[PDB]
Write a protein that binds this ligand. Structure first.
Ligand SMILES: CCN(Cc1ccncc1)c1cc(C)nc(N2CCC[C@H]2CNC(N)=O)n1
Length: 120
């Protein structure tokens, strides 16, 4: 396995630029990887987005030399992407256990929430 929970990656989703995220356990399935291999990630930004991504569409954040990193220009997506970058940079400066406690999304009822530390 190339990744574990808490690892910072860039993931490519169709219709989006390469986005900063953190490998995490799917809070419904209780698993972070499965079978080609997939990994569950949460996307840094202003909304609690998550997804199962194939390993070919993931690379470490901070194989990595072969991808083309392109930043969004469109205002709305760019500001969300910049928020994700600021958060992934702060997470990169912390230990794996500190970033799991600070950035892991929380289910409150059936509603997926940003980690209250991030929300505040
Ligand atoms: C490639 C990462 N992103 C951008 C993003 C991430 C985290 N926060 C903001 C934007 C994703 C990924 C996925 C699977 N879905 C989405 N979304 C669907 C609805 C619009 C957008 C963002 N959500 C929102 N309420 O504004 N975005």
């Amino acid at each position: 396995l190339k990744y574990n929970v808490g690892d910072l990656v860039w993931s490519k989703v169709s219709g989006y630029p390469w986005w900063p995220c953190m490998v995490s356990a799917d809070p419904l399935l209780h698993s972070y990887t499965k079978l080609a291999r997939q990994y569950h990630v949460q996307f840094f930004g202003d909304a609690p987005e998550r997804a199962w991504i194939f390993e070919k569409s993931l690379v470490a954040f901070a194989a990595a030399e072969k991808i083309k990193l392109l930043a969004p220009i469109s205002g709305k997506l760019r500001a969300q992407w910049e928020m994700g970058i600021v958060q992934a940079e702060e997470a990169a400066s912390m230990s794996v256990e500190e970033r799991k406690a600070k950035f892991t999304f929380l289910y409150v009822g059936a509603q997926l929430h940003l980690n209250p530390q991030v929300a505040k």
